[PDB]
Amino acid sequence: MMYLTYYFIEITIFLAILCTIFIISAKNPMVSILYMIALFVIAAMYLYLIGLGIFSLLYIMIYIGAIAVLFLFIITLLDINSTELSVKSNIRDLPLVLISLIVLTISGLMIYSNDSILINKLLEAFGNDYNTIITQDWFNIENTTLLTTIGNVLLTNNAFILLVLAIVLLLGIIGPISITMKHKE
Amino acid sequence: AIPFEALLPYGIIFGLLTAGGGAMQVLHVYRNGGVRDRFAIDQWDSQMMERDLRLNGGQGRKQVDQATAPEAFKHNHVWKSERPLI
Amino acid sequence: MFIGTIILVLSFLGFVFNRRNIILAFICLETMLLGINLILLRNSVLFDDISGSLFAIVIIILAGVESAIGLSLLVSYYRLRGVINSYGI
Amino acid sequence: TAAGISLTGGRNRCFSEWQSFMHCTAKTDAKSRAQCLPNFEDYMECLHHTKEKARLREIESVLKQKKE
Amino acid sequence: EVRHIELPKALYQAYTKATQAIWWPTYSPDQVERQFLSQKIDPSAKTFNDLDLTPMELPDLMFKLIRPYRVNTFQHDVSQLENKEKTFVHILD
Amino acid sequence: MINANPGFWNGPFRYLRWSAHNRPHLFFAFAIGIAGPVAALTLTPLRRKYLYPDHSPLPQSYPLPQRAREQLTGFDDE
Amino acid sequence: PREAAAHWVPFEDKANMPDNVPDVVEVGATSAPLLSASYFIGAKCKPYNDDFMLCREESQGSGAIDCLKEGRRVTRCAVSVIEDINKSCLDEFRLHWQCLEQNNHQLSGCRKAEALLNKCVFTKLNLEKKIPGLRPDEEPVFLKKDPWIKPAVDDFKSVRAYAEAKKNGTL
Amino acid sequence: RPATWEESEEGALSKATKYFLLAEMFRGLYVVLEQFFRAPYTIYYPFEKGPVSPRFR
Amino acid sequence: MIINIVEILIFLVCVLFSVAYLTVAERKTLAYMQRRLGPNFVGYYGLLQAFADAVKLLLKEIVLPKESNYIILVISPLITLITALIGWVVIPLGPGITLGELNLGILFSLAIGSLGVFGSLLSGWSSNSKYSLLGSIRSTAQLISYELILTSIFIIIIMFVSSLNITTIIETQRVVWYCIPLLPLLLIFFIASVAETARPPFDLTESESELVAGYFTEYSGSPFVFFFLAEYSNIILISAFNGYLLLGGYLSFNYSYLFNILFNDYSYVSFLFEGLINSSAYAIKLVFLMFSFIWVRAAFPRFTYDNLINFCWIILLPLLFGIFLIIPSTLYIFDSFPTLI
Amino acid sequence: MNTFIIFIILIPIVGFALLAVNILLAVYKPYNEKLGAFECGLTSFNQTRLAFNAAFILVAILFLPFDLEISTLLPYVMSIYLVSNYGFTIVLLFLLILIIGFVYEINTNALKINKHNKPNTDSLIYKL
Amino acid sequence: SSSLYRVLRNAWEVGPRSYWKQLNSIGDTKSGRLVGTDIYGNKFYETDHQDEIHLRTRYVEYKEKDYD
Numbered sequence A: 001m002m003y004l005t006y007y008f009i010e011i012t013i014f015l016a017i018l019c020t021i022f023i024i025s026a027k028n029p030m031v032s033i034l035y036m037i038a039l040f041v042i043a044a045m046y047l048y049l050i051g052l053g054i055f056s057l058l059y060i061m062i063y064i065g066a067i068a069v070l071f072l073f074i075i076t077l078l079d080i081n082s083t084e085l086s087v088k089s090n091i092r093d094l095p096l097v098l099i100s101l102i103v104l105t106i107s108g109l110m111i112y113s114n115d116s117i118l119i120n121k122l123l124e125a126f127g128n129d130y131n132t133i134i135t136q137d138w139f140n141i142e143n144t145t146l147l148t149t150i151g152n153v154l155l156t157n158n159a160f161i162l163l164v165l166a167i168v169l170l171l172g173i174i175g176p177i178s179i180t181m182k183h184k185e
Numbered sequence B: 001a002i003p004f005e006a007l008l009p010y011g012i013i014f015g016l017l018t019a020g021g022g023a024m025q026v027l028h029v030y031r032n033g034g035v036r037d038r039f040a041i042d043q044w045d046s047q048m049m050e051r052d053l054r055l056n057g058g059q060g061r062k063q064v065d066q067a068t069a070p071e072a073f074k075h076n077h078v079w080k081s082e083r084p085l086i
Numbered sequence C: 001m002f003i004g005t006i007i008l009v010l011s012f013l014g015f016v017f018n019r020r021n022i023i024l025a026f027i028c029l030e031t032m033l034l035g036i037n038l039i040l041l042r043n044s045v046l047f048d049d050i051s052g053s054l055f056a057i058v059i060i061i062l063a064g065v066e067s068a069i070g071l072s073l074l075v076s077y078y079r080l081r082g083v084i085n086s087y088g089i
Numbered sequence D: 001t002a003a004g005i006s007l008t009g010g011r012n013r014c015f016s017e018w019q020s021f022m023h024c025t026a027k028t029d030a031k032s033r034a035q036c037l038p039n040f041e042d043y044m045e046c047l048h049h050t051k052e053k054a055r056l057r058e059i060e061s062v063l064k065q066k067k068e
Numbered sequence E: 001e002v003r004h005i006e007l008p009k010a011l012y013q014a015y016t017k018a019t020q021a022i023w024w025p026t027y028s029p030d031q032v033e034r035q036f037l038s039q040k041i042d043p044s045a046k047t048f049n050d051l052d053l054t055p056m057e058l059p060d061l062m063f064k065l066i067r068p069y070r071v072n073t074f075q076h077d078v079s080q081l082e083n084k085e086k087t088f089v090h091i092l093d
Numbered sequence F: 001m002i003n004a005n006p007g008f009w010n011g012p013f014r015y016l017r018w019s020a021h022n023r024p025h026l027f028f029a030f031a032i033g034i035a036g037p038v039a040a041l042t043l044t045p046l047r048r049k050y051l052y053p054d055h056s057p058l059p060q061s062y063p064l065p066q067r068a069r070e071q072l073t074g075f076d077d078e
Numbered sequence G: 001p002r003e004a005a006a007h008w009v010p011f012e013d014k015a016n017m018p019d020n021v022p023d024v025v026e027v028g029a030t031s032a033p034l035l036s037a038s039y040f041i042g043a044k045c046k047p048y049n050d051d052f053m054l055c056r057e058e059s060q061g062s063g064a065i066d067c068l069k070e071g072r073r074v075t076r077c078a079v080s081v082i083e084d085i086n087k088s089c090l091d092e093f094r095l096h097w098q099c100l101e102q103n104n105h106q107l108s109g110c111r112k113a114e115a116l117l118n119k120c121v122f123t124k125l126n127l128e129k130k131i132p133g134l135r136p137d138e139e140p141v142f143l144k145k146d147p148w149i150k151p152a153v154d155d156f157k158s159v160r161a162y163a164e165a166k167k168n169g170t171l
Numbered sequence H: 001r002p003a004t005w006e007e008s009e010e011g012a013l014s015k016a017t018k019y020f021l022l023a024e025m026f027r028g029l030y031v032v033l034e035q036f037f038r039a040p041y042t043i044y045y046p047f048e049k050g051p052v053s054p055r056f057r
Numbered sequence I: 001m002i003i004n005i006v007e008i009l010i011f012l013v014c015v016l017f018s019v020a021y022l023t024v025a026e027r028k029t030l031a032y033m034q035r036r037l038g039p040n041f042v043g044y045y046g047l048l049q050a051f052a053d054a055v056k057l058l059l060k061e062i063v064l065p066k067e068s069n070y071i072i073l074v075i076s077p078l079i080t081l082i083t084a085l086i087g088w089v090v091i092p093l094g095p096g097i098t099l100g101e102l103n104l105g106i107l108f109s110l111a112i113g114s115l116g117v118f119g120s121l122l123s124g125w126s127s128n129s130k131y132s133l134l135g136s137i138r139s140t141a142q143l144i145s146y147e148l149i150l151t152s153i154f155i156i157i158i159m160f161v162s163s164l165n166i167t168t169i170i171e172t173q174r175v176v177w178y179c180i181p182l183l184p185l186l187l188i189f190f191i192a193s194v195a196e197t198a199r200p201p202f203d204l205t206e207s208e209s210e211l212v213a214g215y216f217t218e219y220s221g222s223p224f225v226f227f228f229l230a231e232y233s234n235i236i237l238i239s240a241f242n243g244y245l246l247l248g249g250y251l252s253f254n255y256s257y258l259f260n261i262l263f264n265d266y267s268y269v270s271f272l273f274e275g276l277i278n279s280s281a282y283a284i285k286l287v288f289l290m291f292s293f294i295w296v297r298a299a300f301p302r303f304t305y306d307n308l309i310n311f312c313w314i315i316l317l318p319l320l321f322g323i324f325l326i327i328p329s330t331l332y333i334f335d336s337f338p339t340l341i
Numbered sequence J: 001m002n003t004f005i006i007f008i009i010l011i012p013i014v015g016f017a018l019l020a021v022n023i024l025l026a027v028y029k030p031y032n033e034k035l036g037a038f039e040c041g042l043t044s045f046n047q048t049r050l051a052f053n054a055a056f057i058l059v060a061i062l063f064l065p066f067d068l069e070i071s072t073l074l075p076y077v078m079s080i081y082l083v084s085n086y087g088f089t090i091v092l093l094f095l096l097i098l099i100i101g102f103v104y105e106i107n108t109n110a111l112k113i114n115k116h117n118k119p120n121t122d123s124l125i126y127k128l
Numbered sequence K: 001s002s003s004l005y006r007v008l009r010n011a012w013e014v015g016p017r018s019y020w021k022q023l024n025s026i027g028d029t030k031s032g033r034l035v036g037t038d039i040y041g042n043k044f045y046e047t048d049h050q051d052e053i054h055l056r057t058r059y060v061e062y063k064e065k066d067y068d
């Protein structure tokens, strides 16, 4: 019973690969948006798995709740023609696709380690074998969670980035009105 | 109130949700052993509950008021070995 | 680390080798940001650090504003043209 | 600005090694900065656990081939 | 693309024999028996032409009969639509 | 037209009367939003002086003393 | 530290402490009686507790191995407090922590047992509850006569005992 | 002539209270609720018939 | 995990049958308001009308038209119903008496309510009809526009209690229900609730579309049953949100005196009576709010899309962006910023 | 196996119960015109989209920033005590800066629907 | 009158047999005096109570379960 839930990170990785392939592959882009929603669900799962369910719910309410909604909103209102995934059109990409897959994945796994010899830089990235010990301390007296600390640092130690995000959101209001609306005089 | 025939469905809704809450209170208490539920529990209370499970014989929320622990409490300590996150 | 790099790389390839849509380009950008945020949050958990989660929530906000602006620009393009075709952005 | 803060609002996992290294940097100049090499090695070891992983690889290999 | 399978007799016949246990009509085992029996027309028997009737045949009526199940996915070659579409109003101010 | 805007700079008080009569959804939102910061600036010190002062801080962690160690005994071994 | 994530197997250790480390009894009380005896532990173990924390801080990393004598003293002082409670003040203590259990370990639902226990320990053991950090102008919340926040159901045994103690002048 | 916002026999705050608190709407709610406590007009047809006259066709 | 299954089944049964009888309650209350009576003939006193409707619908064809899509039409009801029902996991009927006692319960509610918009979005895509794709758009605009007001009221309440645990939000209201200091927010939250449920006076696209050949939900059979369950469950859940945010949830008068009179020690009768009282309070509040939904359907006419969007974005959100400033200022003036738990 | 987990999995993998009951119990023998869609109605191969007013898409595009604003206020209400009288001022400045954009939105009348066929308001003047 | 005292009082007037018959037939509880019977076997009643509205004073109790 113990290890029935061991491979639930690997399953999410597998499902993410699948949903990305379906995004690239779907005929109608509405289906691509739905598979993007499924990928957000998978990411939210993984975030619960590693202990960040607050971010899972934030993702569900922001990404799926607003951004995906707006995507569906625009494809319901705009004519977006599509060419179907074809072998007479896309098979030319296979050599470069495979070369780039190998190169980009291997470099993305090599970039995280500080070892000098290049082959060892990948071999340390795949060195996920030994478990972490979780010991318990008694020093945290309060009920501070991740959201509380985000608020604390964002409103005290990092107040400037919040008061700059305010202007970013002002752009988010003022740009679309300038671009979409036509002012009479 | 006059129209009882209109209040009968409201009475059924009321009775069903009331009985559900009551049965759920009873089942929660049976699960806990004669004690109301805990709620709004933080890290501290979780660690203290695990400590209680170490001091009683795994008997849930049973409390102990003695001043010296059994000599099993010295060797009953748990560390958790976590999967590598990837 | 793995899920994020994989999502990022596959989204980048599905952006680069897209001969189909513009919606796929939008989707691949959003999934790229998702992958970065997941690597970021895994490192946040392992180091027990808040700067990663702060950067992540900031990315959420900025990506929302990016989506809003991008889909306003698409709407201007469609104001003038009336059809968003397979090619031509 | 938010450096050294945990998910719970306090000191992070590898605070002490970082603080030792920064004490030694404050003591030193750019020419005496190489004295702070062991402290930086300790900080990075706390972060990434490379040396402990290699150690456990050795232990496991002795449990692996010298028995079977 | 209509899907067809072409799996053997001893298996399909048993599957049909099993699906007669549900209450609604299904493909019967004797129908897959008749799948091997082509039409043998009796020449001594009368025909349509004795009744001064000339039948239709299937390819001329298949359109009429199957067009309800025709999807009609999209229009043909929307290239050459761009510059004419450019003259219409698509978002009303 | 019937009750058009008279302009804030051609009279503030008349403009605000017009706003209360013809744009209450904006006027009273303005009032609600403005009355918080201004009250926070002006009434808080009066509250500290005449009603009750601010509370003393909560601990937030173990209050580690700022002293050197003292030699103790009691509850030693044996 | 963080809580475990995504999979975790508990593992114990059947080894004994080294012999250069003397033995020390453990405290053995669960959550609720310890929450009830927290303030009486703090009234008596202030020097030992702060010496334990000061030797941890001065050690700068080696507190687990440098602070063992000091932690043994802390444990012994706490055990002495709880032994004194059990020897002398057990009925009121049990009222208090059973009352804590039926609530959510909220001390606001247990004031009628808390009063009896505080009186008993102040008279017999000479340990009083004090919430530090306050001013002389601030009222401690455990001495408020009519609070805003009250329990849903006040504990039955505690109510009967409070009534009897007011009829017998023990309070 | 039409009446402007001046020449108003009703203060701004009073009509703003009627605006924000939905006076007439609560009055309509109450007039609907008063019918909730009045006798239903419904006759159970197969067992009680409606009014017929000698002239009926 | 036996008693877990028992608790889940009890909760499911009570919730679903409450929905099925809310349909009858709607009909009978609207009737007696309209000086009529009905339904009273399909059970004794009308108590099997909803089950008759269900059994009829579950024997009807599941006709899907020529230029429609099978999968979307069939699963959109089911996704809507799943999202409507999993929001009941966090609803407490007592101090901790919940299926999901999450410390992030408000965010779970507020995030699972974010997914109810996809039903109205995907309904429009189940046909090759260009005007239903615009009715979809209008409905989704309404829903996303009133989501902001519900979330704003959520945050204004959480300014008073710095927790996302619904039981803690309720237990803070032993002192005062938050409908007393924030009585206008009760009106606003009820209005936005009626608008999120797409209920009259906010029934624009259902009303709009029954006129036209399309732009409404032309489902038959089981999809239709699922949509009715979703609607009449979201009504109870948004009234539940009203409850535990503003009306104290399960709280009532203090019954310590009565319990010390009736009892001498904690028994299971004691616990059962506590639970019955608490869930009785929660249920009578829910009944009042459902009656209010029905009353508002009986009383008022309908809005248009322009009047509705204007209502929202030019009347309600200004007040709330002002209240965001006035509530923390009121807490700063009196040194009453709330602690965690 | 917690009751939360049991419920949230059980609802999806059981929700198709009445779906299957309806698929197995109910008739299904379609017609052409039962697969049809309306009383009257038709459309040639003219287009795939209708012209829409700007407000229809602007409400959705503006839902994103205001929703992000109200969701960014969540850290504050969960940190309100710890950020005592400093974060209060900071979030007030935040809200004021974001109210300026709302003021812009109102004054531009961006969510208003405009009407083409105006009613004529010009006088009738006769050249003598 | 649509009140509960009406049905309780009438079901005290007409016994439980008549109550269950009326609940299975009419759906409502009515108490009146027997006026007569027709050739088919249907019994006809009239009420004098102020509670019953205009056009609800006369009613039928059919003999057949498949009434018409």
Ligand SMILES: CCCCCCCCCCCCO[C@H]1O[C@H](CO)[C@@H](O[C@H]2O[C@@H](CO)[C@H](O)[C@H](O)[C@@H]2O)[C@H](O)[C@H]1O
Pocket (backbone or CB within 6 Å): I019, I020, I023, I026, I027, I050, I051, I053, I054, I225, I228, I229, I232
């Ligand atoms: C959810 C349980 C699972 C089984 C599903 C049950 C399905 C039954 C749903 C019925 C709910 C009530 O919904 C229904 O209410 C009344 C019933 O008079 C209808 O109303 C109809 O009746 C008249 C009343 O004479 C109204 O004036 C209105 O003009 C309309 O013609 C509503 O148009 C419909 O929405």
